């Protein structure tokens, strides 16, 4: 019934209030709840539901599989995945009426084809590259691809239910790129309109972006990171202050508790060394379970009302504290991550202490570890 | 029947010939293939069967519920598992005949009233702490404990079948930790066995050990990493000069090729800027798969016959690479990880690359990439 090794509690409550926190944010604008990468690591159907539940009217995921297991989960409603590959279930997508986007013109032929097939029109999304250089169609292919779709809508294979972009920097408040890719994405979009599109939404947004730039909302905001509790950066500020409330708490049993003499090495290249006669404690989760193992030495952890650091180097599956004088036994339980609310360490702490962004850190916890649901309702987790 | 985004193609055949190379290493000693953490990110049960075919005589685990997954899928032979915590399956592990490891007298309590419920008895094995200072039991307390076993094994509850230790720094030849944790190990093996312990096996070694020190091979050897053709350091040399075969090899199809014009900024933060109007190149997997984004600008990538390198910020489910003046097309085949004998990036390239280990590459690669089987026996794969 509970895990006792490692284990990851989320809570749906939390994801119901931030969407909630979010939609508050853009009025006048819709929220599409992106639960690509399984949730961030949250569970992608258990948040998908609760967040459609608290007022997403949009879901996003990055690949069409994860599209597709939305669906065989009957979550109903509107759905878009963006990163497609030749040979993808351009059919399938299509006939479970999901909105797919279309970056170049090998994707509008397969698409076209596919519709074809399905006996159904499909409901296509061109996404712009207005600068950030992924993904999406070139300024200087932008003419030929808006053409092609335009003539495609005309053969009833494809209908144009939106025009979009997405944003390099907007993390990184005032930077100069922001506002070039705006103008070129309201640029890009007119001459868009003016050729024969009509969109039924307009979008540009991240999580960054919509909680600073209100000017980027427009008909739709993409808001995955917040929506989990989590702050896009520090310079953004934190969940706190941003109003959100993290979703996810990693928490692990002792599975040892010691006491070694002064000068014993601790792990793996013996990179720590005890100061004096010491209390070292061993943590059940390693970076095969999402602890980085840059983390090293750094790591924070609550464990016996105090806040302990990563003693040496992160293994596969463990690593050791040093609980000093203080004393723990086997089984107690210790905090990797939670609520900062509660006194426990965070994803942006442990961001920094592994020298990257909180995005990798919840994205990245192993699914050898199990999720446990708190919150929402009882039919959200299943 | 062929994943068109990423995919990890695992070539049974490799493993195969890698424990027999290993035995070959250690002729007087026993093998016992270490599976843990999805058998490093190879998949657990068919790499167990192929390991086992070739010659492998034990099967090592860190979680019961690992072992128990072995077990599950009809996996027969000696298995044993060390990671354990106060609560853990104890007796479904004693019913299944798996061989469980104790460091603490919590865990030999534990196990000695699981053997009476399961009526029968556990099959336990004593771990010393020789320096490593992880898990174990520290010198101070061995006494105690070995006290408690052969007093365990009289009420016929346990049988002590093994007494071993794991090395800190096996893997940086001729550390002074090394000798000193061998001598360690003698001496407390031998208090051991005058106290009235008589096990089947004993066992320090893990993979850099194996192939360094033939004085610490005694009865078992417990190689993880080698099986899987990657070298546990360069120090070491590579896998080729150690005769061992890379299993694992990264695959990805890309998902779009275009032409940007020169000063165009690519992906994240803008860490990557065009030198001249060229051709970039989208890799459909990103740091959720397993791309560690600590590799951003440095990643090796094998596309269109010349490995580039990753433009700037690794994302989640992307990164980008510049072709230059070579030209390729969506669906083009990129190889992201393979075999250095053919040309391709390794798991050690990568290791530099994002400034970790080979160790962590191979295990960290996502449950979100499929992993596709080739070699071996065709019911090894299931
Ligand atoms: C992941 C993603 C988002 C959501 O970004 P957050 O910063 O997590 O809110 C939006 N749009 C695209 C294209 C994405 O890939
Ligand atoms: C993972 C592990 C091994 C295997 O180590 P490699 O270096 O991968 O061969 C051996 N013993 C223990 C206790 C381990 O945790």
């Given at each position: ?19 909630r ?50 669906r ?52 296509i999304q061109?996404?712009?590259d ?26 009833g ?37 003016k ?14 972006a ?31 202050q ?7 708490t ?55 009302g ?30 990797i ?6 006194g ?19 994205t ?9 649901y ?7 987790h299943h």
């Amino acid at each position: 019934e509970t895990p006792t090794r490692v284990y990851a509690e989320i809570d749906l409550d939390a994801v119901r209030a931030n969407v909630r926190a979010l939609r508050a944010r853009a009025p006048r604008s819709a929220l599409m709840a992106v639960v690509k990468s399984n949730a961030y690591g949250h569970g992608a159907v258990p948040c998908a539901r609760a967040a459609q539940e608290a007022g997403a009217a949009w879901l996003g995921t990055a690949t069409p599989e994860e599209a597709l297991e939305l669906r065989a989960a009957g979550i109903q409603g509107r759905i878009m995945c963006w990163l497609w590959t030749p040979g993808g279930p351009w059919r399938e997508a299509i006939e479970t009426d999901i909105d797919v986007s279309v970056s170049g013109m090998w994707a509008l032929d397969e698409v076209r084809a596919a519709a074809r097939a399905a006996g159904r029109t499909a409901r296509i999304q061109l996404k712009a590259d207005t600068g950030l250089g992924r993904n999406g169609c070139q300024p200087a292919d932008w003419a030929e691809l808006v053409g092609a779709a335009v003539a495609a809508q005309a053969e009833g294979t494809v209908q144009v239910t939106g025009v979009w972009s997405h944003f390099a920097c907007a993390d990184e408040p005032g930077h100069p790129s922001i506002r070039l890719q705006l103008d070129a994405f309201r640029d890009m979009l007119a001459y868009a309109e003016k050729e024969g599109v009509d969109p039924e939404v307009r979008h540009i947004a991240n999580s960054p972006a919509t909680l600073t730039l209100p000017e980027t909302h427009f008909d739709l905001v993409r808001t995955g990171l917040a929506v989990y509790g989590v702050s896009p950066s520090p310079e953004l500020g934190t969940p706190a202050q941003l109003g959100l409330r993290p979703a996810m708490t990693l928490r692990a049993s002792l599975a040892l508790v010691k006491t070694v003499p002064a000068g014993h090495g601790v792990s793996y290249g013996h990179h720590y060394v005890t100061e004096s006669e010491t209390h070292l404690a061993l943590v059940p989760a390693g970076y095969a379970d999402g602890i980085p193992r840059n983390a090293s030495g750094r790591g924070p952890v609550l464990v016996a009302g105090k806040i302990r650091r990563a003693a040496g180097r992160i293994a596969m599956d463990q690593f050791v504290v040093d609980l000093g004088e203080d004393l723990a036994e086997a089984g107690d339980e210790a905090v990797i991550l939670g609520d900062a609310e509660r006194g426990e360490p965070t994803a942006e702490d442990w961001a920094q202490a592994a020298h990257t962004i909180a995005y990798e850190i919840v994205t990245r916890i192993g699914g050898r570890v199990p999720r446990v649901y708190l919150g929402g309702l009882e039919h959200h987790h299943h």
